[PDB]
Amino acid sequence: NLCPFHEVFNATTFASVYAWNRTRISNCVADYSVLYNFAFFAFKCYGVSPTKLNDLCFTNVYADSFVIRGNEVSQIAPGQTGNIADYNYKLPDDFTGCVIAWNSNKLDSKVSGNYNYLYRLFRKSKLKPFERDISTEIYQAGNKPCNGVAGFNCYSPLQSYGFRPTYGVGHQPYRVVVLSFEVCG
């Protein structure tokens, strides 16, 4: 039995970055050669050469799938900081895995604006590696409680993406699959 990697990459829908989808690959043969024969826009391996992975076995392999902007792809790399790295998808400095990204402007964009992809803008504290919260509780910036009401000095913690087909390269949607290696090639 071969690992269902195509069901991760060629899926019709990806999760939002504030609530990224952690897909577990297990008890299967992992063929990574397909991912090394693309024209994809980025392919970044940290500690795990793409020509070595086919000879390795792992306890588990995790594929985190989500949609972000092109300008935010650089925040996925380990040791980086920013609005995604700190409040949405934090990847550890000691990261072993590959980051695969491609432009999905033709799939994940709409003329009216695709608002089905949300990211977290505000938080009380920055995230730890591979942790995520899906809380929608009102974010308090001020010195007084608003009791859940988005009034003065209170904000809705989530912001939407508004992906559109005519955005620039760095603002067009990218489908990012992060392969974390904890399944034999």
Epitope: L2, E7, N10, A11, T12, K106, L107
Partner: antibody
């Protein structure tokens, strides 16, 4: 990739017909099998879908209760059966290898029905 | 979701451009639509998937695109071998096919 279906059969009303589909040229358990019917002079009508990995199925609302599907991994062959045949069920029954739904996770894929069999004619 | 195709009979001379349309009663994703070609006496084959992505083995004569409820299939130059019946699909809800058109 090729799909080889059985030859034509003639059935009386109330009888059942089971149509085989032998698949080769690819990993059997990596792709699902779909079935599509085409009555004479008509277009394509979907009957159902089955996974070759976990046996999960998905049937069209116009066939539910009549159509059942199974697979045999050891012979890399799919099977479909339509019971309680009506005079309106005369058609060519097609087997196809889909890329529309994942065989393992059951999620929708970006694709279509890539490989088709020659079609099995059932008269009733 | 209901798929309707038009025109029913796109009978055009060889060498000319040929276009077909498919409309949906409900919106579908560009992720979920495909076009098929059926020659007389033969099973249909996949031409385009994902609205615009060309299937393996298919000539560059075939191109297409679409979103929402409006999708199209274009043949840049009609060949003698392109005189077949074409179908549009969707798998956003259950799985269905359009009525089909003859070129």
């Amino acid at each position: 990739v090729q799909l080889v279906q059985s030859g034509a059969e003639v059935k009386k009303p109330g009888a059942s017909v089971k149509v085989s589909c032998k698949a080769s040229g690819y990993p059997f358990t990596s792709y699902g099998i779909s079935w599509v019917r085409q009555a004479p002079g008509q277009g394509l009508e979907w009957m159902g879908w089955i996974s070759t990995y976990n046996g999960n199925t998905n049937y069209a609302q116009k066939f539910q209760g009549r159509v059942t599907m199974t697979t045999d991994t050891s012979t890399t062959t799919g099977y479909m059966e339509l019971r309680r045949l009506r005079s309106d069920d005369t058609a060519v029954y097609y087997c196809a290898r889909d890329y529309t739904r994942g065989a393992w996770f059951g999620e929708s894929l970006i694709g279509g029905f890539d490989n088709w069999g020659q079609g099995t004619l059932v008269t009733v | 979701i209901v798929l309707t195709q038009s025109p029913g009979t796109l009978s055009l001379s060889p060498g000319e451009r040929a276009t077909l349309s498919c409309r949906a009663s409900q919106t579908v994703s560009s992720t979920s639509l495909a076009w098929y070609q059926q020659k007389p006496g033969q099973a249909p084959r996949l031409l385009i998937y994902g609205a615009s992505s060309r299937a393996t083995g298919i000539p560059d004569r075939f191109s297409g695109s679409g979103s929402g409820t409006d999708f199209t299939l274009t043949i840049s130059r009609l060949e003698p071998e392109d005189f077949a019946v074409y179908y549009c699909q969707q798998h956003d809800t259950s799985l269905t096919f359009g009525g089909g058109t003859k070129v």
